Each structure stands twice: as structure tokens, then as C-alpha cells.
Amino acid sequence: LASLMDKAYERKLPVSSLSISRFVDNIASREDLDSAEYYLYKFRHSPNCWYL
RNA sequence: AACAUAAUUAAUUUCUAGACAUCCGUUUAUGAGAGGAGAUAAGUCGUAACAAGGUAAGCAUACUGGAAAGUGUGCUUGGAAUA
Ligand SMILES: [K+]
Ligand SMILES: [K+]
Ligand SMILES: [K+]
Ligand SMILES: [Mg+2]
Ligand SMILES: [Mg+2]
Ligand SMILES: [Mg+2]
Ligand SMILES: [Mg+2]
Ligand SMILES: [Mg+2]
């Protein structure tokens, strides 16, 4: 899932609310939170920020 | 080359990338050298035309000649024509 979102930002394409939802749901470790925090930041600064 | 994301306010992105470089030609300038026309203006050689200009003149054309010009053939009068 990380790769999918990264490609979208590289191509300046909108990311789905379902995509960010799947990431947060499947957090399984303390380290994963740090990555999700970065992707929550990226989602906020993206065209579909309102749809969180 | 023209799709793909997204969508419980709604929008994002694509909506391209080469090759428009030479031209085939076309004008003008330059002019080795070879000619023409005109004027300069004392000359040279002849006297072709104007008088029946001393072989009437001229036209087209041909040949010939230092040069005007000469000769032929048909045509014209812008000549003459009684012995
Ligand atoms: K004569
Ligand atoms: K004479
Ligand atoms: K005469
Ligand atoms: Mg005579
Ligand atoms: Mg004579
Ligand atoms: Mg003649
Ligand atoms: Mg003769
Ligand atoms: Mg003779």
C-alpha cells in the first residue's frame, strides 16, 4: 500500500480515502505508526484531504 | 499522442512528441575582350545625291568594291518623253 500512495504523489494524482483508511487499519507495530504518521501528513496535503 | 485516478463538500491529471533544415530555381551587380551611335571639329580621299547633278532617282533583293557606291531582276514616279 505504501508503494501505491508514493506513486500517486510522484505523478501528482489524487489518493483515495479508502487507501489511507486501509493503511491505518493494518498498523501492526510501533514502527508502523511512524510510517502512517507520514502518510497521514501526505494525505492532508493532497487533493482529497477533505475526504478523510 | 489523447488515457488514468477520483467521487457521502468535490476534484486531480491527460489534453503530447519531432521536423518545419536545405530549396529546385529566379533577378541584379561585376566585364577579359569585342562593337555601335552621337558630338567634338581643322583635316584626308573621292564626288554619291540635289539641274536630264552631267549614267533620271528610289524600293525589295542579290552579288561586288578604299569610300561614298556599282551591276543585275521586278516594281514605283516622289523624272523626262515627240523626229
Ligand atoms: K548615281
Ligand atoms: K553628282
Ligand atoms: K534627278
Ligand atoms: Mg546620277
Ligand atoms: Mg559620272
Ligand atoms: Mg538596293
Ligand atoms: Mg561590278
Ligand atoms: Mg557589267
Swiss-Prot record:
Task: List the subcellular locations.
Answer: Cytoplasm; Mitochondrion
Report the sequence similarity comment from the record. Answer: Belongs to the mitochondrion-specific ribosomal protein mS27 family.
Summarizing the function annotation, the protein's role is: RNA-binding component of the mitochondrial small ribosomal subunit (mt-SSU) that plays a role in mitochondrial protein synthesis. Stimulates mitochondrial mRNA translation of subunit components of the mitochondrial electron transport chain. Binds to the mitochondrial 12S rRNA (12S mt-rRNA) and tRNA(Glu). Overexpressed in hepatocellular carcinoma tissues compared with adjacent non-tumoral liver tissues.
- Record's subunit section: Component of the mitochondrial ribosome small subunit (28S) which comprises a 12S rRNA and about 30 distinct proteins. Interacts with NOA1. Interacts with MIEF1 upstream open reading frame protein. Interacts with METTL17.
Identify this protein by name: Small ribosomal subunit protein mS27
Gene symbol? Mrps27
